[PDB]
Design a protein around this motif. Structure first.
Motif, PDB file in Angstrom:
ATOM      1  N   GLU E  69       0.860  -1.240   0.080  1.00  0.00           N
ATOM      2  CA  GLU E  69      -0.053  -0.033   0.095  1.00  0.00           C
ATOM      3  C   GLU E  69       0.946   1.347   0.018  1.00  0.00           C
ATOM      4  O   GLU E  69       1.785   1.174   0.726  1.00  0.00           O
ATOM      5  CB  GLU E  69      -1.002  -0.009   1.230  1.00  0.00           C
ATOM      6  CG  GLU E  69      -1.915  -1.257   1.339  1.00  0.00           C
ATOM      7  CD  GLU E  69      -2.942  -0.860   2.588  1.00  0.00           C
ATOM      8  OE1 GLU E  69      -3.236   0.137   3.213  1.00  0.00           O
ATOM      9  OE2 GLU E  69      -3.431  -1.943   2.786  1.00  0.00           O
TER      10      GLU E  69
ATOM     11  N   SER F  37     -11.056 -15.819   6.903  1.00  0.00           N
ATOM     12  CA  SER F  37     -11.600 -14.565   6.472  1.00  0.00           C
ATOM     13  C   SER F  37     -12.114 -13.769   7.982  1.00  0.00           C
ATOM     14  O   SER F  37     -12.353 -12.506   7.754  1.00  0.00           O
ATOM     15  CB  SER F  37     -12.743 -14.806   5.797  1.00  0.00           C
ATOM     16  OG  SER F  37     -13.821 -15.600   6.442  1.00  0.00           O
ATOM     17  N   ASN F 277      -4.544  -5.858  10.234  1.00  0.00           N
ATOM     18  CA  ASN F 277      -6.150  -6.165  10.673  1.00  0.00           C
ATOM     19  C   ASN F 277      -5.821  -6.840  12.186  1.00  0.00           C
ATOM     20  O   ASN F 277      -6.950  -6.658  13.024  1.00  0.00           O
ATOM     21  CB  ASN F 277      -6.842  -7.128   9.967  1.00  0.00           C
ATOM     22  CG  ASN F 277      -7.002  -6.598   8.531  1.00  0.00           C
ATOM     23  OD1 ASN F 277      -6.049  -6.477   7.594  1.00  0.00           O
ATOM     24  ND2 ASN F 277      -8.205  -6.276   8.160  1.00  0.00           N
ATOM     25  N   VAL F 289      -7.968 -12.064   4.483  1.00  0.00           N
ATOM     26  CA  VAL F 289      -7.811 -10.851   5.498  1.00  0.00           C
ATOM     27  C   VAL F 289      -7.015  -9.818   4.858  1.00  0.00           C
ATOM     28  O   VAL F 289      -7.567  -8.645   4.983  1.00  0.00           O
ATOM     29  CB  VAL F 289      -7.308 -11.575   6.886  1.00  0.00           C
ATOM     30  CG1 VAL F 289      -7.221 -10.292   7.753  1.00  0.00           C
ATOM     31  CG2 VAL F 289      -8.389 -12.467   7.159  1.00  0.00           C
ATOM     32  N   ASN F 290      -5.917  -9.982   4.659  1.00  0.00           N
ATOM     33  CA  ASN F 290      -5.007  -8.935   4.144  1.00  0.00           C
ATOM     34  C   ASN F 290      -3.664  -9.592   3.305  1.00  0.00           C
ATOM     35  O   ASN F 290      -3.103 -10.293   3.669  1.00  0.00           O
ATOM     36  CB  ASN F 290      -4.492  -7.887   5.169  1.00  0.00           C
ATOM     37  CG  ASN F 290      -3.963  -6.473   4.874  1.00  0.00           C
ATOM     38  OD1 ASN F 290      -3.338  -6.302   3.942  1.00  0.00           O
ATOM     39  ND2 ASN F 290      -4.573  -5.587   5.527  1.00  0.00           N
ATOM     40  N   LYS F 291      -3.657  -8.843   2.017  1.00  0.00           N
ATOM     41  CA  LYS F 291      -2.234  -9.193   1.440  1.00  0.00           C
ATOM     42  C   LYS F 291      -1.064  -9.059   2.192  1.00  0.00           C
ATOM     43  O   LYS F 291      -0.129  -9.690   1.711  1.00  0.00           O
ATOM     44  CB  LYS F 291      -2.317  -8.595  -0.145  1.00  0.00           C
ATOM     45  CG  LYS F 291      -2.155  -6.828   0.020  1.00  0.00           C
ATOM     46  CD  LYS F 291      -2.562  -6.430  -1.365  1.00  0.00           C
ATOM     47  CE  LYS F 291      -2.499  -4.800  -1.577  1.00  0.00           C
ATOM     48  NZ  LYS F 291      -3.896  -4.456  -0.892  1.00  0.00           N
TER      49      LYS F 291
HETATM   50  C1  LIG Z   1      -8.263  -5.685   7.072  1.00  0.00           C
HETATM   51  O1  LIG Z   1      -7.813  -4.443   6.853  1.00  0.00           O
HETATM   52  C2  LIG Z   1      -8.145  -4.091   5.269  1.00  0.00           C
HETATM   53  C3  LIG Z   1      -7.413  -2.599   4.974  1.00  0.00           C
HETATM   54  O2  LIG Z   1      -8.240  -1.661   5.880  1.00  0.00           O
HETATM   55  C4  LIG Z   1      -9.448  -4.089   4.972  1.00  0.00           C
HETATM   56  O3  LIG Z   1      -9.764  -3.818   3.501  1.00  0.00           O
HETATM   57  C5  LIG Z   1     -10.302  -2.738   3.400  1.00  0.00           C
HETATM   58  O4  LIG Z   1     -11.877  -2.690   3.810  1.00  0.00           O
HETATM   59  C6  LIG Z   1     -12.512  -1.629   3.265  1.00  0.00           C
HETATM   60  C7  LIG Z   1     -14.092  -1.810   3.810  1.00  0.00           C
HETATM   61  O5  LIG Z   1     -14.360  -3.209   3.515  1.00  0.00           O
HETATM   62  C8  LIG Z   1     -12.479  -1.250   2.005  1.00  0.00           C
HETATM   63  O6  LIG Z   1     -13.179   0.022   1.607  1.00  0.00           O
HETATM   64  C9  LIG Z   1     -10.895  -0.954   1.511  1.00  0.00           C
HETATM   65  O7  LIG Z   1     -10.843  -0.772  -0.036  1.00  0.00           O
HETATM   66  C10 LIG Z   1     -10.212  -2.242   1.836  1.00  0.00           C
HETATM   67  N1  LIG Z   1      -8.625  -1.842   1.426  1.00  0.00           N
HETATM   68  C11 LIG Z   1      -8.042  -2.766   0.821  1.00  0.00           C
HETATM   69  C12 LIG Z   1      -6.420  -2.423   0.868  1.00  0.00           C
HETATM   70  O8  LIG Z   1      -8.408  -3.850   0.467  1.00  0.00           O
HETATM   71  C13 LIG Z   1     -10.378  -5.319   5.185  1.00  0.00           C
HETATM   72  O9  LIG Z   1     -11.737  -5.527   5.006  1.00  0.00           O
HETATM   73  C14 LIG Z   1      -9.925  -6.065   6.617  1.00  0.00           C
HETATM   74  N2  LIG Z   1     -10.304  -7.299   6.546  1.00  0.00           N
HETATM   75  C15 LIG Z   1     -10.699  -7.779   7.906  1.00  0.00           C
HETATM   76  C16 LIG Z   1     -11.123  -9.292   7.697  1.00  0.00           C
HETATM   77  O10 LIG Z   1     -10.896  -7.359   8.893  1.00  0.00           O
END
Ligand SMILES: *[C@@H]1O[C@H](CO)[C@@H](O[C@@H]2O[C@H](CO)[C@@H](O)[C@H](O)[C@H]2NC(C)=O)[C@H](O)[C@H]1NC(C)=O
Ligand SMILES: *[C@@H]1O[C@H](CO)[C@@H](O[C@@H]2O[C@H](CO)[C@@H](O[C@@H]3O[C@H](CO[C@H]4O[C@H](CO)[C@@H](O)[C@H](O)[C@@H]4O)[C@@H](O)[C@H](O[C@H]4O[C@H](CO)[C@@H](O)[C@H](O)[C@@H]4O)[C@@H]3O)[C@H](O)[C@H]2NC(C)=O)[C@H](O)[C@H]1NC(C)=O
Ligand SMILES: *[C@@H]1O[C@H](CO)[C@@H](O[C@@H]2O[C@H](CO)[C@@H](O[C@@H]3O[C@H](CO[C@H]4O[C@H](CO)[C@@H](O)[C@H](O)[C@@H]4O)[C@@H](O)[C@H](O)[C@@H]3O)[C@H](O)[C@H]2NC(C)=O)[C@H](O)[C@H]1NC(C)=O
Ligand SMILES: *[C@@H]1O[C@H](CO)[C@@H](O[C@@H]2O[C@H](CO)[C@@H](O[C@@H]3O[C@H](CO)[C@@H](O)[C@H](O)[C@@H]3O)[C@H](O)[C@H]2NC(C)=O)[C@H](O)[C@H]1NC(C)=O
Ligand SMILES: *[C@@H]1O[C@H](CO)[C@@H](O[C@@H]2O[C@H](CO)[C@@H](O)[C@H](O)[C@H]2NC(C)=O)[C@H](O)[C@H]1NC(C)=O
Ligand SMILES: *[C@@H]1O[C@H](CO)[C@@H](O[C@@H]2O[C@H](CO)[C@@H](O)[C@H](O)[C@H]2NC(C)=O)[C@H](O)[C@H]1NC(C)=O
Ligand SMILES: *[C@@H]1O[C@H](CO)[C@@H](O[C@@H]2O[C@H](CO)[C@@H](O)[C@H](O)[C@H]2NC(C)=O)[C@H](O)[C@H]1NC(C)=O
Ligand SMILES: *[C@@H]1O[C@H](CO)[C@@H](O[C@@H]2O[C@H](CO)[C@@H](O)[C@H](O)[C@H]2NC(C)=O)[C@H](O)[C@H]1NC(C)=O
Ligand SMILES: *[C@@H]1O[C@H](CO)[C@@H](O[C@@H]2O[C@H](CO)[C@@H](O)[C@H](O)[C@H]2NC(C)=O)[C@H](O)[C@H]1NC(C)=O
Ligand SMILES: *[C@@H]1O[C@H](CO)[C@@H](O)[C@H](O)[C@H]1NC(C)=O
Ligand SMILES: *[C@@H]1O[C@H](CO)[C@@H](O)[C@H](O)[C@H]1NC(C)=O
Ligand SMILES: *[C@@H]1O[C@H](CO)[C@@H](O)[C@H](O)[C@H]1NC(C)=O
Ligand SMILES: *[C@@H]1O[C@H](CO)[C@@H](O)[C@H](O)[C@H]1NC(C)=O
Ligand SMILES: *[C@@H]1O[C@H](CO)[C@@H](O)[C@H](O)[C@H]1NC(C)=O
Ligand SMILES: *[C@@H]1O[C@H](CO)[C@@H](O)[C@H](O)[C@H]1NC(C)=O
Ligand SMILES: *[C@@H]1O[C@H](CO)[C@@H](O)[C@H](O)[C@H]1NC(C)=O
Lengths: 317, 171, 172, 318, 171, 318
Positions: E69, F37, F277, F289-291
Motif C-alpha cells: 500500500e 476470513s 488487521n 484478510v490482508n495481502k
Molecule cells: C483488513 O483491513 C483491510 C485494510 O483496511 C480491509 O480492507 C479494506 O476494507 C475497506 C472496507 O471493506 C475497503 O473499503 C477498502 O478498500 C479495503 N482496503 C484494501 C486495501 O483492500 C479489510 O476489510 C480488513 N479485513 C478484515 C477481515 O478485517
C-alpha cells in the motif's frame, strides 16, 4: 425366437484432435478453442472512453505544445499514442519521463485550473520561434517563461496553498541556456536556480549552460519537473533565474484510466478488451494476440491454440 | 478410457446416430431400429456444459499496469519489468496447458463412463432373460417385438413376464 | 484405487510374473501355467510413456534475466527483485508438487482400470461356461486343455462349443 | 472336471514410494525423478560461447583496465565473472553500475570503434602510476584523460553524428580531484563541468573536489557515465574541465548474451543448461541446484526430490 | 459420479444410517435390519483425511517483503510493485480455485467408487444364489436368517451351502 | 422363501454446497473452509517480538527525534508504525526514504555506537527551536549539526575505519539554508558540499539554498543520506560546509525483522501470523484478510470462502 439389442455411442467422420494427460493428440467428436488468436484490427470506442492522441503524445498534450492544445481539459479511460506523434515546441526533456507519463495516464484527465501567481519584477510570457502559436512566436500553453524586466531579475518567492480537498499536480521547468551571453541576457544572474517545495518535499535544480544538438533552431533545452501538493499543504517557488513557471495545476484523479501505444484505427463498435492490435472478444479465457491489454481481457499465453474437448472420443472405425 | 466401453468393448461409434450421444439399436422379427437414449445423452451434455461454463467464466479486468515494450535500453529496472512479465506469462501458459490436459482426460473418461452406465442399466433390467455378448450387445432369449424393445428403452420392461420363455431358451 | 481390482478383489500381485504387467495363471488337466497378457501390459505402458513424455518435454530456454544474489544492502529495488524471484519459485514449487500428486493418483487408477478391463473382457468371453470366484479367478465348468486356455488368452474362445458341457456341470 | 483361470498383475519385492492426492507415501513398482539435484561442478564450453573473465570484471574489460585489455573486442553468449577479479587502474565508481553491467552483458560484445574526436586546445592521453601499462604510467585504453594545454583549458564543444544503422554506446567520465591545487593544475578552472547530450537526452555532471580513501596512491576518483546514440541522432560533448573523454563507441547488439558470477571451472563437454555450480542436464522438468541459470534449463523448485510413478501399485503381500 | 452408484443405481442415501457411511439393509424371515459396513466407511474416511492433511500441511513463512500500500503517487516503481503483487494474488487465487474443484470432483468420485466396490464385493460373495435387482439390492433365493445375513456382511458366507436351494428357486 | 439385501450409503437432511470441475454448486454431506476470513483484530505479542512505535516512525526513532528518544537501541522482529505518528524535530527529507526505512526495518535493531569523530575548527551540537528537548532548543540525538567557530569553517576531512567484523550503517545529512545570509552566517563559505565515501563508493551532495514553507518556524531543511561500511573498509567525510555529521554507527544485522503499518492494538496472546488487521490463525492454507502479512501465514487469495468436500454427495431424495 429372440432378438438382439445393442448399446452404442455416436461418432463423426472427422473429429478434432486434443491433448490429454497421456496423449499429445487424441481425436474427440468436438472441441472448442480456448485461445483468442484473432482481432478485427480496430479498437472499439465503446464502452471505454478512448482518446486518440493523433499527432500528440500525452506529455506534449500535458505541457500544451500548441499543435496539442486541442487536448486541453480532455479526459479518457484509454489515451492512445500513435507512432506518428511529434513535438513542435521548445526542445525539452523530462527526467523520469516514464513516471510522469504513467501518473498522468492513470489520473485520466488533463483538467487544468489557472492560478493567480504573481511574478514581481520579471517579464512574463516569453516565447520562441521554435514554438509558434499562430503566425507568431509562442510557448507551451501551461508554462510561463519568465525573464528579466529592465536590467534586473529579482529573487522570486511565491506561494500557492492547496485549500481544496484533492491533490494538485504542478508542472514546471528549468531553462538551460546554451551560452553565457544567453544566460545573462535573459536572467541577469550569471548562474540561476530553481527551488520548488512543499512542507514535505523539495527540489532545487541548477541550470547547466552548454550546447545540446540543434533542435528546431535551438541548442538550449528546458527540463521538466513536477510537484504534487496535497490538501492543506502549500507550494512555494523560489528562483533567481531560469524558472519556467507553472500557470496553475492539473486536478489529480484516481480510477481506471491508462495509456497504450497503438496504430490501430478506432471504430464505432463495442468491446470490453483492447490490445494494441485492436479490440478482441473476451469469451475465451486465454489469448495470444498481445501481452499488452486494457479492460476485461483473456489472459495472455504463449500457445496459439488450446482445444477443450466438448465430446467423447471419436471412433468412427 | 478408464471404463473400457468407448474405444473398448464397444468396437466403434455410430455415425448414423444423429439425435443422441448414446442409444440402442435392435434387430427382432419386425426388422431393425435405432433410438437415442435421452437421459445418458443429457447427463454427458450437462457435465460438459458445466465444465465449459466454469472455464469460460469471467475474464479478469485490468486497467493501468506496467509497460511491456521499450524503445530504449535502460538496464536494471527494465530487466525487472520484462522478467516479471515473462514470469507471469510462463506461469499462465503452464496453467492453460495443464487445465486442458486434465479437463480433456476427464471428458473422455466421463463420456466412457456414461456409455458403461447405460450398458450396466440395460443389463440389470434384462435380469435372466438376456446374455451379454461381449460387444455391447445383449442376446435376448424371448420374442421381443417393437413394443417390447421400446419397454426396455423406456425402463418399463417387466422381466418376469418373459422369464419362463427366456430360461427355457437359454438353458 | 477407484476400480477395486489391484489391492482389491485381486488380493496381491505376482512377483513371479516377470514378463508382463498383467496376465493369467491357470490350472487344468494338463497342469498349471502362467502367461503375460501383452495387450493390457502394452496399454498401460503406452499410457505411462505418454504422460512421461508430456511431462519431460520442452524445458524453457531463458537467457539474460535479473540478478538473484546481492553483495550489498540496497533497499527498495533489491527488495522487489528478491520478492519477484521468491514468488516465482514458490509458484513453480507448488505446480511441481501438484503435478506429481495428480499424475500419480491417475497412474494408480489407470493401472487398476487396465486390470479390471482385462478381468471383465475375460468374463465376457466365457459367457455361461464359467463363474467369477470373487478373487480375480474364474471357475470354468468344462474340460479346458492347454489349447483351450490359449484360446481364451488370445481372444478366440468359442463359448458355444463348450456350453452344453458347462451348463450341465454348473446347474445339474 | 474343469479348470481355473486366474487374472493378476506383477509386483516386485520392493518398489518406490511416491506421493498422490490422498497419500504422502504409497508404493509403486517404479518411478522416475523429476528434480535435477546434482551437477558435475563444471561449466561446459559448448554449445554456448563462454568467456571466462579470469582476473577481470566485465566493467573493467569494458573500460580497458590494462590487465583486462586481453578482452578487447571479445564476444560471448555467457561472460563468467570470477570472485578473484580485481581492478588495477584509476579508482572509479559507476553510478548505476548494475545497469551498465547488465546492458553490456546483454549486448554480448565489447566491439569498439575508435572515432576521430578533435580536442582543440587541451593535452590528450593523460596517465597515472595507479594504472601502469607495461613499465610506465598509463590509463584505461577506451578513455582519454584531457588536461590543460599551456595555461588554459578552453570550452570543449564537439559533436559526433551517428550515421550508422545501429546504436552506439559511449562510455565517458568525470574526474573528481582530491584538492583545489589538483583541480587548477589540471583544468585551470576552479570548478569543471561535463555535459553530454543527444537530441532527446542530456546529462550534466559537476565534479566534487575532496578526498576519498587512498586507493593505489590516489585520493581522487573518476565517475563513469554512458550515453546511447541512435541512428540519425548525434552526440554533443561540452566541457570546461574534468572530462574523461571517450575514444569511440561500443557497437550495441541484441541477442541471447548474459553474465554470471561463478567460480566453477570450465570443461570441454556439452550442456544446454549452465548454473553457477556447473552445468546440469535438462532432461528433467525441475531442478534444485540453483535459481540462477542460463540456457534451456529445468525450472527451479524448492523440493530436492519429486517422484513420478511409472508403474502400478506394488502389492506383493495381501 | 463416474461409477454410477451414488445418485445412480442406488436411488438415494439413507438418512437413517447414522453409524456409518456405507452399509446394508435386509429383509428376511426374522424381520428387517440395518448395519454399517466398517471397512468401506473407513476406506472413504481415510482417503478423505489423507487428502485434507495434504492440503492443510505447512503454510510458508515469510518475513520482510515488499510494500503493498502506498500513500503518494510515484509512477514507474510503484506501478511495478503493485503489478507484481496483483499478479501473484491472481495466480494464487487461481491455484486455490482449481485445487478445490479437482479435489471435490475426486472426493465425489472416490466415494461413489467405494459404494460400487462394496456392491460388487457383495454380488461376488453371493455367486449363483442371488440376482441383482438393479437398484442396489440383491434378491437372495434361499432362506437367509440373521446369522446368514451376518455371514454376508462379515465376508464369510459359503455360497455352496445354499446353492442347491437357490438354483431350484431361481431356475 | 428368500431374502433381500440392499446396499446403500448415508445422507443428511441438508448438507453443504461445494464446487467441482463440472458443477458450480453441488451438495455433499460435509465440507471444511480453506480460506481464513476473520481476525480478532489484535496483534498477539508472542512469539514474535513486537515493538509498538506509538507516536514515532522508524526513521524518526533512527535519527533520534527527541520524543522518540525512548526507542534508542531498541530491537524488534516486527516494528509497528501507527497512523498517529508525527515528527517534531528539524524539518527533513530522505531521498529514497522507502529504502532507508526498509533496510533499517530488516536489520531489526537501532543498536548505536558512538565514535570519537574529531571535527577540528567547528562548533558542534547545533540546536533548533524546531526540535526542542525539554523547553530548550535541540536536534536529532544521532546527528551533529556543525557550524563555524570564530569566523571560519575549515575543510573537514576525517576518516573512521571499520575494524570490526560486522557492517556499519552511518546516517548523515546536508543542511539546506533558506537564504545566502544564513549560509554564510553558519558556514562562512558561500556554497558548501558534502562528500562521503568508502573505498569503492561515494556520495556527493551540494546544498540547495532557498525559501520553503515554514515548518515549526523554519524555511530551511535537512536531507538525510546513509552509507554502509563493511569490515576492512573505511569511511571518509570531506566537507567545506553544510554537513550534518554522524555521531557513530548503527550495527547492521540480518534476520527475520520487518515493519508493518497498523493501528491494531497489541494483546497478550500467541499467534505465528500477523496482518495489519490483527493476528490470524494459520491452520488454513489460504486467507482473505490482508495481502500484507508477517510470519507463518496462509496465502492471500481473493475468494472469501472455498469449501473442500469431506464427504460424499448428499442425496436424501431421488
Ligand atoms: C483488513 O483491513 C483491510 C485494510 O483496511 C480491509 O480492507 C479494506 O476494507 C475497506 C472496507 O471493506 C475497503 O473499503 C477498502 O478498500 C479495503 N482496503 C484494501 C486495501 O483492500 C479489510 O476489510 C480488513 N479485513 C478484515 C477481515 O478485517
Ligand atoms: C583527508 O583525510 C584522509 C583520511 O585521513 C587522508 O587520507 C590518508 O592519506 C595518507 C597519506 O597520503 C595515506 O597514507 C598512505 O597509506 C598508504 C597505505 O598504507 C597501508 O599499507 C602500508 C604499507 O603496506 C602500511 O604501512 C599501512 O599501515 C597501510 O596498511 C601507504 O602505502 C602510504 O605510504 C607511502 O606514502 C607515504 C606518504 O607519501 C609515506 O609516508 C610512506 O613511506 C610510503 O611512501 C601512505 O602512508 C592514508 O592511507 C590515507 N587514509 C585514507 C583512509 O585514505 C587524506 O590524506 C586527507 N586529505 C588531505 C588533503 O589532507
Ligand atoms: C558546439 O558544437 C555544436 C556541434 O558542432 C554546434 O552546433 C551546430 O551549430 C550549427 C550552427 O548553428 C548548426 O548549424 C545549423 O544547422 C541547421 C540544420 O542543419 C541540418 O539540417 C539542414 C536542413 O535539413 C541541412 O541543410 C544540414 O545539412 C543539416 O542536416 C541548418 O539548417 C542551419 O543553417 C545551421 O547551419 C548545427 O546544426 C549544429 N550541430 C549540431 C549537431 O547541433 C554549436 O554551434 C557549438 N556551439 C558553440 C558555442 O560553438
Ligand atoms: C518566501 O515566501 C514564503 C511563503 O510566502 C514566506 O514564508 C512565510 O514567512 C512568513 C514570515 O515569517 C511566515 O509568517 C509566520 O506565520 C505564522 C503563522 O503560521 C506566524 O505564527 C508567525 O508569526 C509568522 O508571521 C509564513 O508562515 C511563511 N509562509 C509559508 C507558507 O511558509 C517567506 O517568508 C518568504 N521568504 C522570504 C525570504 O521572503
Ligand atoms: C461443439 O462444442 C461447442 C461448445 O459446446 C458448441 O458450441 C456451442 O453451441 C451452442 C449452440 O450453437 C452455442 O449457442 C454456444 O455459444 C456454443 N458455445 C461455444 C463455446 O462456442 C458447438 O455447437 C459444438 N459443435 C457441434 C458440431 O456440436
Ligand atoms: C478545465 O477543467 C477544470 C476542472 O474541472 C475546470 O475547473 C472547474 O470549472 C467549473 C466550471 O467553471 C467549476 O464549477 C469548478 O469549480 C472548477 N474546478 C476547480 C477545482 O476550480 C475548468 O474551468 C476547465 N477549463 C476550461 C477552460 O474549461
Ligand atoms: C499483434 O501485434 C504484435 C506486436 O506488433 C505482433 O507481434 C509481432 O509480430 C511480428 C510478426 O510476427 C514479429 O516480427 C514481432 O517480433 C512481434 N512482436 C512481438 C512483441 O511479439 C502480433 O503478431 C500481432 N498479432 C495479431 C493477431 O495481429
Ligand atoms: C414404454 O413402452 C411401452 C411399449 O411401447 C408403452 O406401452 C405401449 O404404448 C403403446 C403406444 O402408446 C400402446 O399401443 C400399447 O398399448 C402400450 N403397451 C403396453 C405394454 O402398455 C409405454 O407407453 C411406454 N411407457 C412410457 C413411460 O413411455
Ligand atoms: C549450488 O551453489 C549454491 C550457491 O552457492 C549452493 O547454495 C548454498 O548452499 C549452502 C550449503 O547448503 C548454503 O549454506 C547457502 O545458503 C546456499 N546459498 C544460497 C544462495 O542458496 C548449493 O548448495 C549448490 N548446489 C549444489 C547441488 O551444488
Ligand atoms: C489362439 O489359440 C489357439 C489355440 O492354441 C490357436 O489355434 C490359434 O492359432 C490362436 N490364435 C491366434 C490369433 O493366435
Ligand atoms: C520396502 O522398504 C521399506 C523400507 O525402506 C519398507 O518400509 C516397505 O514396507 C518395504 N516394502 C514392502 C513391499 O515390503
Ligand atoms: C522405471 O521407469 C523408467 C521411466 O520410464 C525406466 O526408464 C526404467 O527402466 C524403469 N525401470 C524398470 C524396473 O522398469
Ligand atoms: C573491433 O571490432 C569492430 C567492430 O566489428 C571492428 O570494426 C574493429 O576493427 C575491431 N578492432 C580491432 C582492433 O580489431
Ligand atoms: C460372521 O458371521 C457369523 C454369524 O452369522 C459368525 O458366527 C462369525 O463369527 C462371523 N465372523 C466374524 C469374523 O465376525
Ligand atoms: C466435517 O468435516 C470436518 C473435516 O474432516 C470434520 O472435522 C467435521 O467434524 C465434519 N463434521 C461431520 C458432521 O462429520
Ligand atoms: C546502545 O548499545 C551500545 C552497544 O551495546 C552501547 O554502547 C550504548 O551505550 C547503548 N545506548 C544506550 C542508550 O543504552
Amino acid at each position: 425366437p429372440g432378438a438382439t439389442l445393442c448399446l452404442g455411442h455416436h461418432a463423426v467422420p472427422n473429429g478434432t484432435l486434443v491433448k490429454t494427460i497421456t496423449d499429445d493428440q487424441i481425436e474427440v467428436t468436438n472441441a472448442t478453442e480456448l485461445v483468442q488468436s484473432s482481432s478485427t484490427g480496430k479498437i472499439c470506442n465503446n464502452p471505454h472512453r478512448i482518446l486518440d492522441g493523433i499527432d500528440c503524445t500525452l506529455i506534449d498534450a500535458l505541457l500544451g505544445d500548441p499543435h496539442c492544445d486541442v487536448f486541453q481539459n480532455e479526459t479518457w479511460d484509454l489515451f492512445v499514442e500513435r507512432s506518428k506523434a511529434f513535438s513542435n515546441c521548445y526542445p525539452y526533456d523530462v527526467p523520469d519521463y516514464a513516471s510522469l507519463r504513467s501518473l498522468v495516464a492513470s489520473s485520466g484527465t488533463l483538467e487544468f485550473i489557472t492560478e493567480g501567481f504573481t511574478w514581481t519584477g520579471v517579464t512574463q510570457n516569453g516565447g520562441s520561434n521554435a514554438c509558434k502559436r499562430g503566425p507568431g512566436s509562442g510557448f507551451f500553453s501551461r508554462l510561463n517563461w519568465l525573464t528579466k524586466s529592465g536590467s534586473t531579475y529579482p529573487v522570486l518567492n511565491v506561494t500557492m496553498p492547496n485549500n481544496d480537498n484533492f491533490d494538485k499536480l504542478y508542472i514546471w521547468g528549468v531553462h538551460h541556456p546554451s551560452t553565457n551571453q544567453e544566460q545573462t541576457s535573459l536572467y541577469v544572474q550569471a548562474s540561476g536556480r530553481v527551488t520548488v517545495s512543499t512542507r514535505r518535499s523539495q527540489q532545487t535544480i541548477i541550470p547547466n549552460i552548454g550546447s545540446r544538438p540543434w533542435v528546431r533552431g535551438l541548442s538550449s533545452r528546458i527540463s521538466i519537473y513536477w510537484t504534487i501538493v496535497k490538501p492543506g499543504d502549500v507550494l512555494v517557488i523560489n528562483s533567481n533565474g531560469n524558472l519556467i513557471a507553472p500557470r496553475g495545476y492539473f486536478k489529480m484523479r484516481t480510477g481506471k484510466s491508462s495509456i497504450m501505444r497503438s496504430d490501430a484505427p478506432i471504430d464505432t463498435c463495442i468491446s470490453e478488451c483492447i490490445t494494441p492490435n485492436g479490440s478482441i472478444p473476451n469469451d475465451k479465457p486465454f489469448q495470444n494476440v498481445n501481452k499488452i491489454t486494457y479492460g476485461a481481457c483473456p489472459k495472455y499465453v504463449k500457445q496459439n491454440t488450446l482445444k477443450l474437448a466438448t465430446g467423447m472420443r471419436n471412433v468412427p472405425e | 478410457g478408464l471404463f473400457g466401453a468407448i474405444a473398448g468393448f464397444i468396437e466403434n461409434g455410430w455415425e448414423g446416430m444423429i439425435d443422441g450421444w448414446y442409444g440402442f439399436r435392435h434387430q427382432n422379427s419386425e426388422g431393425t431400429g435405432q433410438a437415442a437414449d435421452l437421459k445418458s445423452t443429457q447427463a454427458a451434455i450437462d457435465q460438459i456444459n458445466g465444465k465449459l461454463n466454469r472455464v469460460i467464466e469471467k475474464t479478469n479486468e485490468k486497467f493501468h499496469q506496467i509497460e511491456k515494450e521499450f524503445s530504449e535500453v535502460e538496464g536494471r529496472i527494465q530487466d525487472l519489468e520484462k522478467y516479471v512479465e515473462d514470469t507471469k506469462i510462463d506461469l499462465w501458459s503452464y496453467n492453460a496447458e495443464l487445465l486442458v490436459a486434465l479437463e480433456n482426460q476427464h471428458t473422455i473418461d466421463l463420456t466412457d463412463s456414461e456409455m458403461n452406465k447405460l450398458f450396466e442399466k440395460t443389463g440389470r433390467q434384462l435380469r435372466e432373460n438376456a446374455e451379454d455378448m461381449g460387444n455391447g450387445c445383449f442376446k435376448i432369449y424371448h420374442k421381443c417385438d417393437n413394443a417390447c424393445i421400446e419397454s426396455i428403452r423406456n425402463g418399463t420392461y417387466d422381466h418376469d413376464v418373459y422369464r419362463d420363455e427366456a430360461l427355457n431358451n437359454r438353458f
